Design a binder for these strands. Structure first.
Ligand code: NI
Ligand code: NI
Ligand code: NI
Ligand code: NI
Length: 57
DNA sequence: AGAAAGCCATTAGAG
DNA sequence: TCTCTAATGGCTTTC
């Protein structure tokens, strides 16, 4: 099973990542609810995004 | 302590 | 057949 994230979900997450590369638990809960994703998906998106951030300085 | 969260390598599924 | 990235597993680190 693999969900494709919409333009809107990816853009909202990228905009969040612009300010904070790590999330507080309280903020993770808000983003999950606003985007209709689980907290675990939000957690994994930021982990993947940080790993991609490392490979690009 | 031990649960939550992170980091890495890796997979695999959508398009 | 490609690329991209969602998603996993096994550790390590944080708190
Ligand atoms: Ni700015
Ligand atoms: Ni321990
Ligand atoms: Ni923790
Ligand atoms: Ni494949």
């Amino acid at each position: 099973g693999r969900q494709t994230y919409t333009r809107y979900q990816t853009l909202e997450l990228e905009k969040e990542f612009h300010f904070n590369r790590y999330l507080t638990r309280r903020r993770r809960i808000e983003i999950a609810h606003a985007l209709s994703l689980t907290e675990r998906q939000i957690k994994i998106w930021f982990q993947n995004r940080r790993m991609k951030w490392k490979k690009e300085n």
